[PDB]
Paper text:
The cadherin-catenin cell adhesion complex is the major building block of AJs, and has a crucial function in the dynamic behaviors of epithelial cells, such as cell polarization and cell rearrangements. The structure of α-catenin (100 kDa) consists of three distinct domains. The C-terminal actin-binding domain (ABD) (28 kDa), which is connected to the rest by a flexible P-linker region28 (2 kDa), directly binds to F-actin, and closely resembles the vinculin ABD (vin-ABD). The direct interaction between α-catenin and F-actin was demonstrated to be a catch bond, an interaction that is stabilized by increased force.
To assess whether the α1-helix affects the α-catenin-F-actin interaction, we performed in vitro actin cosedimentation assays with three ABD variants of αE- and αN-catenin (αE-catenin residue numbers are shown): a wild type form of ABD (ABD-WT; residues 652-906), an ABD with a structure-guided helix-1 mutation (H1) designed to unfold α1-helix (ABD-H1; RAIM670-673GSGS), and an ABD with a partially deleted α1-helix (ABD-Δα1; residues 671-906). We observed a nearly two-fold increase in the cosedimented amount of either ABD-H1 or ABD-Δα1 compared to ABD-WT. To examine the structural details of αcat-ABD with enhanced F-actin binding, we determined crystal structures of αNcat-ABD-H1. However, unlike the monomeric αNcat-ABD-WT structure, αNcat-ABD-H1 crystallized as a homodimer connected by two βH motifs. The dimer interface involves L807N of the βH, which mimics M673N of α1-helix interacting with the hydrophobic patch in the αNcat-ABD-WT structure. Moreover, the observation of αNcat-ABD-H1 dimerization, which occludes 3100 Å2 of solvent-accessible surface, in two distinct crystal forms provides a basis for further examining the physiological relevance of this ABD-dimer interface. Our NMR analysis of αNcat-ABD-H1 in solution showed that concentration-dependent chemical shift perturbations (CSPs) mostly occurred in the βH motif. In addition, we performed chemical shift (CS)-based Rosetta comparative modeling (CM)48 to show that V796N of αNcat-ABD-WT remained in the cryptic state, whereas αNcat-ABD-H1 displayed a large conformational change that exposed V796N on the surface, resembling V796 in the crystal structure of αEcat-ABD-WT. Our αNcat-ABD-H1 crystal structures revealed an unexpected ABD homodimerization, which can facilitate F-actin bundling in vitro. It involves the βH motif forming an extensive dimer interface with the hydrophobic patch uncovered by α1-helix unfolding.
Residue numbers in the entry:
A (entry chain A), B (entry chain A): 670 to 861
Write the structure that this text describes.
């Protein structure tokens, strides 16, 4: 034996946070659906980050390929690696951008991505523990899954904003320097 | 919120293992009650090991001064330090012993103490965790407290045997070499 289901209250709070997460995920799907991700690794990395975040939130609902805390920790580290790669590419977009306010916006969103990848790493431990409290041995940390989902939602939101700001910064470069700029855009935005 | 009581089944299995532990602890109390522990640090260390094991088993019943897993881990490390000190002293008793079979017995019980201190260190983590199993997020490891109590019971039993074998080895030294042996017994066994 040795196992028990989460209290029904906790299962309810989880399905509630997962719904909020799914609404942020829809924003990313809508944004990414416009573009052909050939020649745009920011889109590819965003889709990969999104897919892994879906695995992590599915874990909290008893779904998907992640079975234990170790898998969830490894998923968070993969998200962080992808965010590190998106960061390097979007930094080059921002450097190429001729508008200082679009550039600053984009760089600030990248710092948000770094912070939220780190916070997702922290929450991926989904810690439970026993403690001696109130004259009983109790199991604490049962709401850790909810912190995980909210950290995923925060990261999803920053990825959405970063993808949009990368597009905006790209169009400023082309508007100013033309489609005939000698240096090609770091990333291309072609419709689907 | 965030916390829940252990399933009543688990609370029952814990009170059952604690009872078995208490019977081994009684054997130590009976053995230690005979002796004045002045001049006998094997007795002192055994009492200290016993007292800390009582704190650890009390933790599983919602009693005593240990409140969280970190306290229980620290308690196990204190037990291991005391066992290391008892080991050095009882080794000197065994070295002084003129009967090779009592000496071997005693040294073998000391290796049992080392093994059971190590196993108690492992069990003191009393690990809980969530996992994605059977289409649900469940809490596993709720029987970890039972492994902790049994590891304490194993160590208690080896301490009882070690105290007895230290006494036996001491009396062989005095029987053979007399109360006028030029080298005094490593440890003294005086009645109370």
């Amino acid at each position: 034996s040795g196992s028990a289901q989460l209290p029904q209250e906790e299962k309810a709070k989880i399905a509630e946070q997962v719904e909020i997460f799914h609404q942020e995920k829809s924003k990313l799907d809508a944004e990414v659906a416009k573009w052909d991700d050939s020649g745009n690794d920011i889109i590819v990395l965003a889709k990969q980050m999104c897919m892994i975040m879906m695995e992590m939130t599915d874990f909290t609902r008893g779904k998907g390929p992640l079975k234990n805390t170790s898998d969830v920790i490894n998923a968070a580290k993969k998200i962080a690696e992808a965010g590190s790669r998106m960061d390097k590419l979007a930094r080059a977009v921002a450097d190429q951008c001729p508008d200082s306010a679009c550039k600053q916006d984009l760089l600030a969103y990248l710092q948000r991505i770094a912070l939220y990848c780190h916070q997702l790493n922290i929450c991926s431990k989904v810690k439970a523990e026993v403690q001696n409290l109130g004259g009983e041995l109790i199991v604490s940390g049962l709401d850790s899954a909810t912190s995980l989902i909210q950290a995923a939602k925060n990261l999803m939101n920053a990825v959405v904003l970063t993808v949009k700001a990368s597009y905006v910064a790209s169009t400023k470069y082309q508007k100013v320097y033309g489609t005939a700029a000698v240096n090609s855009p770091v990333v291309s935005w072609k419709m689907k």
